[PDB]
Amino acid sequence: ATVQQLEGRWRLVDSKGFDEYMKELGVGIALRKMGAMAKPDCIITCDGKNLTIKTESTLKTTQFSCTLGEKFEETTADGRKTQTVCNFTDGALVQHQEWDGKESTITRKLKDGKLVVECVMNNVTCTRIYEKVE
Numbered sequence: 001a002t003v004q005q006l007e008g009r010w011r012l013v014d015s016k017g018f019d020e021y022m023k024e025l026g027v028g029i030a031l032r033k034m035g036a037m038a039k040p041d042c043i044i045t046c047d048g049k050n051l052t053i054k055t056e057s058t059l060k061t062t063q064f065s066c067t068l069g070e071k072f073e074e075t076t077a078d079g080r081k082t083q084t085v086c087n088f089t090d091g092a093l094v095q096h097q098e099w100d101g102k103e104s105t106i107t108r109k110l111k112d113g114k115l116v117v118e119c120v121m122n123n124v125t126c127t128r129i130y131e132k133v134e
């Protein structure tokens with residue numbers, strides 16, 4: 001397993017728990033309705049240690065870039081400004097966010113050709129499945 005295996009355009013095909021996760025983050029109604037309705041593509045690109053993740057839906061486009069292992073300021077889709085670190089560890093990309101004394105982790109892994117995204121904050125979870133598309 002390598003980080004390069006995560007590269008490409010991926011399309012959301014299933015979501016569980018996301019609304020509960022957004023509620024744990026304290027996201028307000030407008031953004032929760034967007035999160036519930038949007039069916040994003042995620043575009044992952046990497047060159048060595050540089051990683052970029054872009055998302056595109058009918059509602060919103062987002063993007064961040066980082067160096068694997070380096071702490072950086074991430075402005076999230078819900079508007080937090082987190083201290084984030086991304087690492088490819090034990091066959092997953094792990095995105096660890098810290099802000100205001102809180103923490104949340106997002107993992108991304110290839111399983112049976114699909115991109116499995118899992119979110120957690122304070123034992124509130126979600127699982128989002130994406131299929132590789134052209």
Ligand SMILES: CCOC(=O)c1c(NC(=O)[C@H]2CCCC[C@H]2C(=O)O)sc(C(N)=O)c1C
Pocket residue numbers: 022027031032034035036038039040055056057058059060061062077078106117119128
């Ligand atoms: C604030 C509520 O909306 C959203 O969060 C949201 C996205 N969130 C994410 O991309 C991450 C969310 C956290 C898990 C990893 C990612 C994933 O979705 O798989 S993309 C997106 C869009 N382009 O439309 C929207 C609206």
